[PDB]
Amino acid sequence: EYERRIAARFTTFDQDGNGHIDRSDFSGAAKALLAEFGVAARSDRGQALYGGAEALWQGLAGIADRDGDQRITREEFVKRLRDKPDRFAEIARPFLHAALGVADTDGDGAVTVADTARALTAFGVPEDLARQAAAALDTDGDGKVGETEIVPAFARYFTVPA
């Protein structure tokens, strides 16, 4: 179970599935989300999402790329994330904020549960599970998913329970 839980988290970052985490895993994730919502890469929201993704890669690399080759292997990839999950969530905050912007289709600063599910599928979550996860992210049940729900959820998700 534990090792399976760890692989799940690794697989989330290893978007292209090739067994190491690269900047391009993150670039690819940004590209997928923008495509899902028809947001132009060159738009303000597009540039903000790529900048946020690049910042999260650098944070994660800072933590886990022990030999400095700018790929994080399965091997290199948990304890550091478990002991300080809040710090890692803040590293991800610009990315998560930008992702919400992209998934906000009417511009009112809120994202629907259905569009949260769309975002998750852009990041490789199969459609059925994404609906279930999106629903779970809406912890106050108002049908709107926000930064105050997503950022702590992210912190928790990357705290692999022992």
- What residue type is assigned to position 136 of the chain? A
Tokens coding 10: 């690794």
Residue 10 as a binder of Ca ion (CB under 5 A): the answer is no
Q: Is the dihedral of CA 11, 17, 19, 24 positive or negative?
A: negative
7 binds Ca ion (CB under 5 A): no
Phi, psi at 112, each rounded to 5°: -75, 160
What number of chain residues touch Ca ion (CB under 5 A)?
Answer: 19
Identify which of residues 45 and 162 has a Cβ nearer to Ca ion in the complex.
45
126's tokens: 């199969």
Binding window for Ca ion (CB under 5 A); candidates: 46-54, 55-63, 91-99, 153-161 = 46-54
**Residues 6+ away with beta carbon under 8 Å from 92:** 56, 59, 151, 154
The residue among 86 and 142 lying less far from Ca ion, judged by its C-beta, is 142
Interacting residues with Ca ion (CB under 5 A): 14, 16, 18, 25, 47, 65, 67, 69, 104-106, 108, 110, 127-128, 138, 140, 142, 144
